[PDB]
Symmetry: D2
Subunit: 264 residues, 4 copies
């Protein structure tokens, strides 16, 4: 009876459905797939990328970028929410192919350096090509590219290095505060008494408060269904979107329900 | 007029005064120098090292270890307070020469990986040979070696990855709770409105509370004068030692005095 | 039409067939599977491991080690042939779980650091959890553990950092020179005019000469069928084994046949 | 008697004498100091940098670049000869400050990753801030930036990852083949019977042959005096320059004299 064959990290078919670039604000675009968010901000001095999706989306991301007049050498910075396979996937390949720089915090960098291996909750179940972080950022550090300022908000929970990003764009003159909050989910995570993550509960609760008090007029999540976005219906994709309070308050209800269900 | 020559990181002569191993508890020893703490815990299954001092103390540390019947292949784990040149110095050389493993948190690992370069406050002024962290630990994670349990307490302040370590030894039967708290100093640090460290103030204040509520009967610091230790006077070196409350309360007074002196 | 799902690196069922430790010489053992070689040398001062197989063999390797009276903290060094998924697989997990040190050359280290990703010929097709090399070794460097000396012989071909290892054991007194030569195969490799590996041909030809002039009385390969070993038939597993000249001369014939078949 | 204070890596005052950009060919410039070569190639799609000098030249290099109409975000690639403190010094700082990518071979990358620490011949005597290599290149790999092709020629000797670079520029129409050969010196190196570098002799001799058979009409070295360049006398700085044959033949004479002087 041989040892078992390796299993591939398979996701839903909706996560790999390539969509055309959908505009979010004057300078913010969505270039990922139908249920995976990949954001591209076009500044005068280059382009910023936030997340990327699955590792096999590197070629799709480059197309959407090329459609927006952005050549590979124009992508200056790659910002991340958290470094899992379905979010920080093609980061290694995009660095090799575009000459961009990764800006992430320490806990995200160390995870990104080992390709998601030895995950606190998944182990080596999901694994993506490893990338290196080029700039270590702290909580509240402002990253400016082409005059657009990205401020980091640490929300340690899903991963130790989860980070929500805040920037201010425009909408034909009207400034629009954008918040890109990370997933507040705990899928299969052992919440109470976790040896790998001992302060997981307090970290989650403190993250719930963080997202509530965010400067935000329009919120986006790595998974659109978390913010009730619907990338498929084009323009009215942001209609039934949630607030910051509504998002963190809904996540907290599912977290308390998870912790109570775990006592039994 | 040429560009300026590099300056060597020079310290006080007391920091490099090699001292003989001085016993702290039944299983805890001090093997560093007169004003630099290097702790060695002798378990049944190997030896743990906490800090090491300046990079040029690697050969002195090995001697003291050999005096305590500890061969190079007997040092299993290296634990760190914070990864600066005068504390995590010979860590690279000790890994090459003893086959030990480094256990540090993410913020300490990333700093240890670039040899203290690009320090938030010192820049490239101090720089030591880089080492790699072999185990990433979280706040409150218990590291056990030979039945002796080390629990990590994060005190982000001096460095983002500052860590106080707690273990329980004996004293001819009587169990003695030991706490190795990191420096709570801010030498030349810009406290108010630091762009590299924006949440420095709240991080310091939260560290002050952490050290107060530590399980501790005998406290040690990387610099003995911080805990009013006097490694020179041998046995009575722990006489006038401070408490946890007294240490963090004294550091907080000097921090508030520093922040107020900084407004002017 | 969604983007394609990731494919798992699946191997033959014979490669994952766990076998009992089979003795090769007085101090050399085989602890891998039926068609994957994992060698364990038991010295007076610790145990050396050469290769490991697929990443999912970490738990099987520990069993065989425990059967040979070798505790996890007794494995001092991990030596590698080349750093592919089916050979350097569980190296990350074994470091975390045994406190061993990896000794590999630069080209093997850099590949091992990115988990086989961006392979010159496979790309991201095969990928294993990344590990870090703790000692960089040169061509002809002698690694000694417990009085047993391992000398490295670089054979750049299959991978840039391919390495054959030579050590001298015993056989009830009679010294036996052992050579562990790496695979000399080029499965699907583009030999003529490769942009990623331009000097591939000369490197292969020079490797063919290297293996011929090896100090060797008994040869082993990462794949037993390459040396005509038959781990299944226990004691007579080394009966129809090949020589060094016969191995490199057979590989060269298949390489010239491959290069000529490639001109057409 | 305390342990000795650290010593700073001090160089000659000529090595830090900032000079104005001196043109070498139509697209090649020298932007370093009087006796340290830092080359800048201006292509239509960005700028390439070869070497940089001492770590404290990062601010001087940026000035000369800004004088040549090259903004920090215009430097796309950093190529290296060998990764020592006086050559690959400001590479860490230039990556943080310009968003460039480092292209070096494996042996150069691993050295660059530990900041020159644990040098085969200098140990931790010289140490610079560590940088990370973004693209691993092989012997004979062509790197193209803005239509200008750089081909790598490995000359393992001074360091295991020594590399000479060849590109073809112009001189008001006339194409000029440029070769940037690494130092062929062995200052204090133990040539015969070196345990850290066992194949040092054959590696040097093979490097001597490599540089002779280089496509080169004008040669430059990291140290101008090695090629009898005189950056000080402006235009006639390339007058009494050596050939490829003359350079490698002169270095070989000093190497054989060194090895014979070493037998005694
Ligand atoms: C690692 O990727 C996630 N999990 C998985 O892909 C699958 C799983 O979790 O069972 C396997 C995860 O992070 O848990 C991703 N992320 C989210 C999320 O909402 O963040 C949800 C929920 C599931 O899919
Ligand atoms: C980097 O090492 C420290 N600083 C220095 O060595 C010197 C400096 O700071 O001026 C230079 C530091 O951490 O600030 C060390 N540490 C402590 C401390 O008390 O932690 C104090 C105070 C000074 O010496
Ligand atoms: C990457 O692992 C090898 N390839 C594969 O696993 C499969 C493939 O190559 O098609 C995929 C390889 O190295 O080519 C391994 N190694 C050998 C070998 O003989 O070395 C042979 C032949 C195939 O299996
Ligand atoms: C490490 O830097 C070099 N050495 C030094 O700086 C000094 C030394 O070597 O004594 C110390 C070196 O590489 O040897 C540099 N390089 C060359 C050279 O010609 O390459 C020569 C000769 C000396 O200066
Ligand atoms: Zn995730
Ligand atoms: Zn997710
Ligand atoms: Zn410090
Ligand atoms: Zn200090
Ligand atoms: Zn292979
Ligand atoms: Zn193989
Ligand atoms: Zn040098
Ligand atoms: Zn030099």
């Amino acid at each position: 009876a041989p040892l078992p064959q390796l299993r591939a990290y398979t996701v839903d078919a909706s996560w790999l459905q390539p969509m055309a670039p959908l505009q979010v604000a004057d300078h913010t675009w969505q270039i990922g797939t139908e249920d995976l968010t990949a954001l591209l901000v076009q500044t005068a001095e280059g382009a910023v990328l936030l997340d990327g999706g699955m590792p096999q989306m590197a070629g799709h991301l480059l197309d959407n970028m090329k459609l927006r007049g952005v050549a590979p050498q124009d992508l200056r910075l790659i910002l991340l929410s958290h470094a899992h396979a379905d979010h920080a996937g093609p980061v290694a390949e995009l660095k090799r192919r575009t000459g961009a720089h990764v800006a992430a915090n320490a806990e995200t960098a160390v995870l990104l350096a080992r390709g998601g291996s030895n995950d606190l909750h998944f182990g080596d179940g999901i694994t993506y090509p490893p990338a290196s972080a080029d700039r270590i950022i702290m909580d509240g550090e402002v990253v400016t590219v082409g005059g657009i300022a990205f401020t980091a908000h640490f929300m340690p929970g899903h991963t130790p290095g989860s980070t929500a990003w805040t920037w201010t764009d425009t909408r034909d003159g009207k400034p629009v505060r954008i918040a890109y909050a990370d997933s507040l989910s705990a899928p299969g995570y052992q919440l109470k008494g976790n040896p790998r993550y001992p302060r997981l509960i307090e970290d989650y609760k403190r993250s719930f408060a963080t997202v509530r008090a965010l400067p935000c007029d329009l919120l986006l999540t790595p998974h659109p269904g978390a913010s009730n976005w619907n990338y498929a219906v084009g323009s009215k994709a942001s209609a039934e979107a949630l607030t910051c309070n509504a998002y963190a308050d809904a996540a907290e209800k599912k977290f308390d329900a998870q912790l109570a269900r775990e006592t039994a």
